[PDB]
Amino acid sequence: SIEEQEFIGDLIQVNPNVKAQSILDITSDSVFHKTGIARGHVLFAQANSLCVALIKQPTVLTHESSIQFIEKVKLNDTVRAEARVVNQTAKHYYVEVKSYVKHTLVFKGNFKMFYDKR
Amino acid sequence: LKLKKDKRREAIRQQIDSNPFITDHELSDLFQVSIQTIRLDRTYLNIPELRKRIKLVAEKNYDQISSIEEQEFIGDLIQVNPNVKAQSILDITSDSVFHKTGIARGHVLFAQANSLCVALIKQPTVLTHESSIQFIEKVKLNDTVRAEARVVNQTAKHYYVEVKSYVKHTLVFKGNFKMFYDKR
Amino acid sequence: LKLKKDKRREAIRQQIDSNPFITDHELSDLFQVSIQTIRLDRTYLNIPELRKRIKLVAEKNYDQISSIEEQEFIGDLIQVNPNVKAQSILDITSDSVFHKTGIARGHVLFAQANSLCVALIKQPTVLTHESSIQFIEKVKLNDTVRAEARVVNQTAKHYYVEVKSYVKHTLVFKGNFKMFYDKR
Amino acid sequence: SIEEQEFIGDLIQVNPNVKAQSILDITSDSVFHKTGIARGHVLFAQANSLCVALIKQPTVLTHESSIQFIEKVKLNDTVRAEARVVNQTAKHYYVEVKSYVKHTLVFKGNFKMFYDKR
Ligand SMILES: [Cl-]
Ligand SMILES: [Cl-]
Ligand SMILES: [Cl-]
Ligand SMILES: [Cl-]
Ligand SMILES: [Cl-]
Ligand SMILES: [Cl-]
Ligand SMILES: [Cl-]
Ligand SMILES: [Cl-]
Ligand SMILES: [Cl-]
Ligand SMILES: [Cl-]
Ligand SMILES: [Cl-]
Ligand SMILES: [Cl-]
Ligand SMILES: [Cl-]
Ligand SMILES: [Cl-]
Ligand SMILES: [Cl-]
Ligand SMILES: [Cl-]
Ligand SMILES: [Cl-]
Ligand SMILES: [Cl-]
């Protein structure tokens, strides 16, 4: 169940502290059974868990985010999430994630992530 | 001076009929008896513990909705008026938090909020198009987050939903949701 | 793009079934149509104006209680769970206020609060023994004060009730009530 | 109806700005019909409207009050309320009211009244 998972998807390319990509197969757990359509929060968890993974800081907490679910994702798609750090301050990393199915943008998020060295 | 047993028990049944989510502790303070007394009173009355009562209230709610089912729904659906407003609670357990700090991961609260909005809308097809969210306070291991969803606009193609999430009385999460829908 | 008439009307009926106290203005903002449209929709649906809907909801409530009757009750009793919690609203009119300032007299809000506590408790005999009250903000001509009463303790002889009163979302009045009761 | 009345009872003695007494007959409007017992708020309105009456200030607003309903008042009683000013500051008058039926105390209130010269 999505809320009980740490990192969602498989990491396939990572450049620590800079950018990363993960892939996620869309199985029947991730969709509504009558339509076959992925649940927004599965794609969100992939994007947000990717940001947390790539940021090399002891603690990383999501402060804010804006997301668009641009296309319907379907049972049996593979969603490639591509994350990159746009800016970094003393307190935040600003991270953009664009997720694809083959070559069509299906999801875009902006993440404002808090961090600290504890 | 304190209530006779039979009067106290009638009064417990009434409290619970009116607020199923009232705790043993709160009942205890209400009647100025021990938690033990409240527990023994529940046993006599066949009133299940709080967590069982929540799952029972929620079962009734899953029948009122259509966009999502119990198996997929994140948290327990405690209150629903389809197309108008809804609430859920989510107990935050060890799998939802970082090991060192005990803080809930970002996607946990979003997952509660998004499924609440999906559940809220009773149309053949429903899905989130856009969302905007803020994490207002750290949520912690063993907290219960109560999410409140309400419809604020409805167009031909979208429901705009506003979500506020609480731990006790503190606001911890806030989100706007643009819900796409279609009757086909 | 906006809802077809028949869809809008279904959606109005649902909004009102779920919150009888929703205003034409609020319905208007919800569906992004004019107040005129909402009014004409109510007429088509035979939904009475807000104030009529309040008196109707309240009639049902007077049957649930026993300590007080409609004729004596100050305000309209909008929500009641006997021995647990209740709410009323009171429209503040010219007779309740000073001429120069338009401020509600002290005893008006106390009168709403006291009858709410009396109404709340469902015992043969009920009366206030003690009360402690604060007037937190000036209440004004043509405001609606919403009073919220809840039971916080029950002994063999008393219900302790806590009252909070609001104008929109501002707290304006606060009171503790020690209610005597007896079953004879 | 009590909330639609300005001054409750008849004034029978007044010493402006200092102390006053009023009497109130308890008719069937002021009681619950099944018990015959006066409503707390009728006695409160008598006490509080008496304070407001006796204070000689352009505006007088009740800020706080503590009251005790010491005896049951009954249909056909006359309640004599006796009010007096205990203290006065630049912003408040502190007023005590004790109300009687014949010679038995049936009600006691303390009132903290705000005032201003507008
Ligand atoms: Cl780096
Ligand atoms: Cl979704
Ligand atoms: Cl930067
Ligand atoms: Cl793109
Ligand atoms: Cl008893
Ligand atoms: Cl409990
Ligand atoms: Cl005990
Ligand atoms: Cl439990
Ligand atoms: Cl908690
Ligand atoms: Cl439509
Ligand atoms: Cl209205
Ligand atoms: Cl219009
Ligand atoms: Cl109206
Ligand atoms: Cl108002
Ligand atoms: Cl003087
Ligand atoms: Cl009373
Ligand atoms: Cl003085
Ligand atoms: Cl005395």
Residue numbers in the entry:
A (entry chain B), D (entry chain B): 72 to 189
B (entry chain A), C (entry chain A): 6 to 189
The authors write:
In order to shed light on this fundamental mechanism, we studied S. aureus FapR (SaFapR) a transcription factor that senses the levels of malonyl-CoA, a key intermediate in fatty acid biosynthesis, and modulates the expression of genes involved in fatty acid and phospholipid biosynthesis. FapR has been shown to globally repress the expression of the genes from the fap regulon encoding the soluble FASII system as well as two key enzymes that interface this pathway with the synthesis of phospholipid molecules. Like most transcriptional regulators in bacteria, FapR is a homodimeric repressor. Each protomer consists of a N-terminal DNA-binding domain (DBD) harboring a classical helix-turn-helix motif connected through a linker α-helix (αL) to a C-terminal effector-binding domain (EBD).
The crystal structure of full-length SaFapR in the absence of ligands has been obtained in two different crystal forms. In that sense, in one protomer of the crystal form 2 both helix αL and its associated DBD are highly flexible and could not be modeled, suggesting a marginal stability of the observed quaternary arrangement. Similarly to other homodimeric proteins studied by single-molecule or NMR relaxation approaches, our crystallographic studies suggest that the two conformational states of SaFapR (i.e. with EBD-bound or EBD-detached DBDs) can be populated in the ligand-free repressor species.
